[PDB]
N, C-alpha and C. Protein backbone atom coordinates (compact mmCIF):
# COMPACT_ATOMS: atom_id res chain seq x y z
N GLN A 1 120.95 79.73 45.95
CA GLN A 1 121.71 79.22 46.37
C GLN A 1 121.90 80.07 48.27
N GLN A 2 121.59 79.10 49.20
CA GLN A 2 122.67 79.80 50.35
C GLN A 2 121.47 80.65 50.51
N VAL A 3 121.31 81.03 51.82
CA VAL A 3 120.17 82.15 52.27
C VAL A 3 120.21 83.28 51.35
N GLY A 4 119.18 83.91 51.01
CA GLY A 4 119.54 85.46 50.37
C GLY A 4 120.72 84.91 49.08
N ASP A 5 121.17 86.39 48.34
CA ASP A 5 122.04 85.99 47.43
C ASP A 5 123.56 87.72 47.69
N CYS A 6 123.54 87.18 48.50
CA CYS A 6 124.99 89.39 48.14
C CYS A 6 126.70 88.55 47.96
N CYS A 7 127.72 89.24 47.34
CA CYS A 7 129.16 89.26 47.20
C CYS A 7 130.05 90.34 47.43
N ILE A 8 130.75 90.65 47.61
CA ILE A 8 131.95 91.79 47.86
C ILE A 8 132.49 92.25 46.32
N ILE A 9 132.37 92.68 46.36
CA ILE A 9 133.02 93.39 45.21
C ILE A 9 134.14 94.85 45.33
N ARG A 10 134.79 94.92 44.40
CA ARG A 10 136.23 95.54 44.36
C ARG A 10 135.94 97.13 43.96
N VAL A 11 135.88 98.11 44.88
CA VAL A 11 135.47 99.63 43.85
C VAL A 11 136.68 100.18 44.04
N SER A 12 137.49 100.44 42.44
CA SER A 12 138.35 101.24 43.04
C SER A 12 138.49 102.74 41.81
N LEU A 13 139.12 104.30 41.82
CA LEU A 13 138.35 105.22 42.12
C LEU A 13 138.34 105.18 40.04
N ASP A 14 137.77 106.36 39.41
CA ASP A 14 139.09 106.57 38.26
C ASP A 14 139.86 107.41 37.88
N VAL A 15 141.48 106.96 38.46
CA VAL A 15 141.88 107.94 38.49
C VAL A 15 143.12 107.04 37.11
N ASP A 16 144.24 105.99 37.85
CA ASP A 16 144.53 105.26 36.11
C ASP A 16 145.76 103.95 36.83
N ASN A 17 146.39 104.10 37.69
CA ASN A 17 147.61 103.44 38.51
C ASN A 17 146.65 102.68 39.29
N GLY A 18 146.97 101.97 40.28
CA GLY A 18 146.61 101.86 41.10
C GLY A 18 146.61 102.58 42.55
N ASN A 19 145.61 101.83 43.78
CA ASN A 19 145.29 103.20 44.00
C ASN A 19 145.09 102.85 45.95
N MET A 20 143.75 103.34 46.08
CA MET A 20 142.99 102.51 47.16
C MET A 20 141.97 102.04 47.19
N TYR A 21 142.16 100.78 46.78
CA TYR A 21 140.69 99.66 46.62
C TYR A 21 140.65 99.39 47.79
N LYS A 22 138.73 99.94 47.52
CA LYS A 22 138.10 99.51 48.27
C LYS A 22 137.16 98.13 48.23
N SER A 23 136.24 97.70 49.32
CA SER A 23 135.78 96.63 49.08
C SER A 23 133.94 96.88 49.82
N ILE A 24 133.18 96.54 48.75
CA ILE A 24 131.59 96.31 50.03
C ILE A 24 130.83 95.23 49.39
N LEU A 25 129.76 95.35 50.27
CA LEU A 25 128.54 93.64 49.74
C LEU A 25 127.81 94.35 49.53
N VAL A 26 127.12 93.83 47.92
CA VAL A 26 126.26 93.90 47.52
C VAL A 26 125.03 92.78 47.52
N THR A 27 124.34 93.15 47.12
CA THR A 27 122.97 92.19 47.67
C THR A 27 122.17 92.03 47.03
N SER A 28 121.02 91.23 45.92
CA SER A 28 120.49 90.96 45.02
C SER A 28 120.04 92.03 44.57
N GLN A 29 119.43 92.82 44.83
CA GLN A 29 118.38 94.13 44.30
C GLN A 29 119.62 95.65 44.83
N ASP A 30 120.58 95.46 44.40
CA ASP A 30 122.22 96.55 44.64
C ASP A 30 121.98 97.16 43.18
N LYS A 31 121.73 98.21 43.59
CA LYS A 31 121.78 99.33 42.65
C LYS A 31 122.82 99.87 42.29
N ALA A 32 122.83 100.21 41.46
CA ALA A 32 124.23 101.04 40.76
C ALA A 32 124.40 102.94 41.18
N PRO A 33 123.71 103.01 42.28
CA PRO A 33 123.12 104.17 42.69
C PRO A 33 123.49 103.71 43.97
N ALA A 34 123.40 102.32 44.08
CA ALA A 34 123.29 102.77 45.99
C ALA A 34 125.18 101.70 45.76
N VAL A 35 125.39 100.70 45.34
CA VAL A 35 127.05 100.39 45.04
C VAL A 35 127.96 101.94 45.79
N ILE A 36 127.44 103.13 44.83
CA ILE A 36 128.47 104.41 44.54
C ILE A 36 128.32 104.65 45.60
N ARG A 37 126.58 104.66 46.30
CA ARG A 37 126.19 105.72 47.90
C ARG A 37 128.33 104.92 48.21
N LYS A 38 127.86 103.21 48.82
CA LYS A 38 128.55 102.75 49.55
C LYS A 38 129.96 103.18 49.21
N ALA A 39 130.79 102.78 48.36
CA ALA A 39 132.27 103.01 47.89
C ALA A 39 132.89 104.44 47.50
N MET A 40 131.42 106.44 47.97
CA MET A 40 131.75 106.95 47.85
C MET A 40 132.01 107.84 49.41
N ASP A 41 131.48 107.18 50.25
CA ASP A 41 131.58 107.55 51.54
C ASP A 41 132.62 106.68 51.97
N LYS A 42 133.16 105.65 51.68
CA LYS A 42 134.31 105.39 51.23
C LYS A 42 135.45 105.41 50.84
N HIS A 43 135.37 106.02 49.90
CA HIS A 43 136.25 107.46 49.60
C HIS A 43 136.30 108.43 50.08
N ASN A 44 135.54 108.95 50.66
CA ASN A 44 134.87 110.63 51.35
C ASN A 44 135.18 111.52 50.42
N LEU A 45 134.09 111.27 49.28
CA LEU A 45 134.03 112.36 48.20
C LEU A 45 132.38 112.29 48.35
N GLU A 46 132.65 113.07 49.60
CA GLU A 46 130.85 114.17 49.34
C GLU A 46 130.75 115.08 48.39
N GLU A 47 131.97 115.64 47.60
CA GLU A 47 131.79 116.18 47.12
C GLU A 47 130.92 116.62 46.13
N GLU A 48 130.84 114.99 45.69
CA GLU A 48 129.66 115.02 44.48
C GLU A 48 128.16 114.18 44.89
N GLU A 49 127.08 113.60 44.11
CA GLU A 49 126.18 113.16 44.51
C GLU A 49 126.83 111.44 43.46
N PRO A 50 125.85 110.35 43.70
CA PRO A 50 126.43 108.68 43.19
C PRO A 50 125.90 109.16 41.70
N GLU A 51 124.76 109.70 41.19
CA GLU A 51 124.44 109.54 40.39
C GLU A 51 124.92 110.39 39.20
N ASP A 52 126.42 111.46 40.35
CA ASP A 52 126.91 111.96 38.79
C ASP A 52 128.57 110.69 38.61
N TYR A 53 128.09 109.46 39.37
CA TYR A 53 129.52 108.76 38.75
C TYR A 53 128.59 107.09 37.84
N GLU A 54 129.45 106.44 36.98
CA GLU A 54 129.48 105.50 36.62
C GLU A 54 129.34 104.22 37.62
N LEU A 55 128.85 102.97 37.57
CA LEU A 55 129.50 102.00 38.05
C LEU A 55 130.07 101.51 36.89
N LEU A 56 131.82 100.71 36.79
CA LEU A 56 132.03 100.03 35.67
C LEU A 56 132.75 98.73 36.38
N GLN A 57 132.11 97.62 35.48
CA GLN A 57 133.04 96.25 35.73
C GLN A 57 133.92 96.33 35.05
N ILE A 58 134.89 95.66 35.41
CA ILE A 58 136.48 95.28 34.62
C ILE A 58 136.21 93.93 34.64
N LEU A 59 137.32 93.36 33.62
CA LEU A 59 136.55 92.04 33.22
C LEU A 59 138.53 91.54 32.24
N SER A 60 138.67 92.11 31.25
CA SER A 60 139.92 91.43 30.97
C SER A 60 140.92 93.01 31.66
N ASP A 61 142.08 92.83 30.21
CA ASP A 61 143.02 93.95 31.18
C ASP A 61 143.21 94.91 29.71
N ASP A 62 141.68 95.38 29.67
CA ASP A 62 141.21 96.41 28.82
C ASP A 62 139.77 96.38 28.11
N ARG A 63 138.94 95.53 28.39
CA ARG A 63 137.63 95.07 28.21
C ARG A 63 136.88 95.80 29.73
N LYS A 64 136.05 96.74 30.05
CA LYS A 64 135.63 96.62 30.85
C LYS A 64 134.26 96.86 30.52
N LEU A 65 133.24 97.18 31.30
CA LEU A 65 131.52 97.02 30.90
C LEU A 65 130.65 98.17 32.00
N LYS A 66 129.56 98.56 31.80
CA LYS A 66 128.96 99.57 32.83
C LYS A 66 128.00 99.14 33.15
N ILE A 67 127.48 99.29 34.00
CA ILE A 67 125.67 99.15 34.80
C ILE A 67 125.40 100.45 35.14
N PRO A 68 123.49 99.96 34.94
CA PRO A 68 123.21 100.85 34.61
C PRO A 68 122.12 101.25 36.11
N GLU A 69 121.79 102.15 35.61
CA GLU A 69 121.71 102.67 37.82
C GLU A 69 120.24 101.60 38.51
N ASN A 70 120.01 100.55 38.17
CA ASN A 70 119.01 100.01 38.77
C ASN A 70 119.25 98.28 38.88
N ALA A 71 120.41 98.44 37.81
CA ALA A 71 120.88 96.71 36.82
C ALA A 71 121.21 95.99 38.20
N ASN A 72 120.43 95.36 38.63
CA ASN A 72 121.00 94.07 39.75
C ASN A 72 122.70 93.24 39.32
N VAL A 73 123.84 94.66 40.46
CA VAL A 73 124.78 94.21 40.34
C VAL A 73 124.96 92.63 40.29
N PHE A 74 124.53 92.49 41.45
CA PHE A 74 125.00 90.61 41.21
C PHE A 74 124.56 89.72 40.34
N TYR A 75 123.92 90.63 39.11
CA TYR A 75 122.87 89.99 38.12
C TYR A 75 123.42 91.01 36.94
N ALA A 76 124.21 91.29 36.50
CA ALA A 76 124.56 92.10 35.42
C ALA A 76 126.14 92.82 35.43
N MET A 77 126.77 91.95 35.99
CA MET A 77 128.68 91.96 36.04
C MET A 77 128.38 90.51 35.40
N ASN A 78 129.63 90.59 34.79
CA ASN A 78 130.22 89.60 33.93
C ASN A 78 130.84 88.53 34.78
N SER A 79 129.70 87.90 35.01
CA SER A 79 130.46 86.29 36.34
C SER A 79 132.19 86.17 35.45
N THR A 80 132.20 85.37 34.45
CA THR A 80 133.15 84.52 33.50
C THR A 80 135.04 85.49 34.08
N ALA A 81 133.96 86.54 34.71
CA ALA A 81 135.44 87.45 34.50
C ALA A 81 135.46 87.43 36.78
N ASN A 82 136.16 88.82 37.32
CA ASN A 82 136.44 89.28 38.54
C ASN A 82 135.20 90.46 38.91
N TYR A 83 134.80 89.95 39.98
CA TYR A 83 134.14 91.30 40.40
C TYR A 83 135.05 92.64 40.98
N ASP A 84 135.44 93.14 40.30
CA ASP A 84 136.30 94.66 40.17
C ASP A 84 135.72 95.79 39.84
N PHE A 85 135.45 96.49 40.24
CA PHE A 85 134.44 97.87 39.37
C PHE A 85 135.20 99.11 39.25
N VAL A 86 134.60 99.85 38.54
CA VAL A 86 135.35 101.33 38.46
C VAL A 86 134.33 102.23 38.91
N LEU A 87 134.93 103.54 40.08
CA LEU A 87 133.92 104.16 40.12
C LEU A 87 133.94 105.84 38.99
N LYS A 88 133.74 105.19 38.27
CA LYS A 88 133.78 106.96 37.13
C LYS A 88 132.97 108.54 37.43
N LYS A 89 133.56 109.54 37.02
CA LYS A 89 132.62 110.58 36.89
C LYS A 89 131.75 110.17 35.72
N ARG A 90 130.12 110.97 35.45
CA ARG A 90 130.18 111.64 34.96
C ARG A 90 130.35 112.74 34.36
N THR A 91 131.92 113.13 34.29
CA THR A 91 132.32 114.28 33.44
C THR A 91 132.35 114.13 32.15
N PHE A 92 132.49 115.20 31.13
CA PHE A 92 132.18 115.30 30.07
C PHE A 92 132.83 115.02 29.47
N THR A 93 132.87 113.58 28.56
CA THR A 93 133.51 112.22 28.05
C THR A 93 132.76 111.15 28.07
C-alpha cells in the first residue's frame, strides 16, 4: 500500500500523568533503538543511551505491549489499538 510504508507514532515518557507527548515517523525497518533515538533526542535525555530504554505500545487504558530491539515497529504494534508509545528506562524493575 502506497510507496514504501511509514506512519506517525506518539511517544510519552515514563512519567505518570499527561506530559510532553512527542510525535515521530517510523519506517518499515524502524527498529526499537531507532524510534528511541528520535524520541530521546526530542526529550533531551542524552543523559542515557537508547539501549537503556524500553519501547512500549499502549493499547487499552491499562494494557501495554513491549517491542524488542529489532521488531519492525510498523509491524510490531497492535494495529487494532492506537499508535501510542511509552519510552521507559531499563531501571531495576
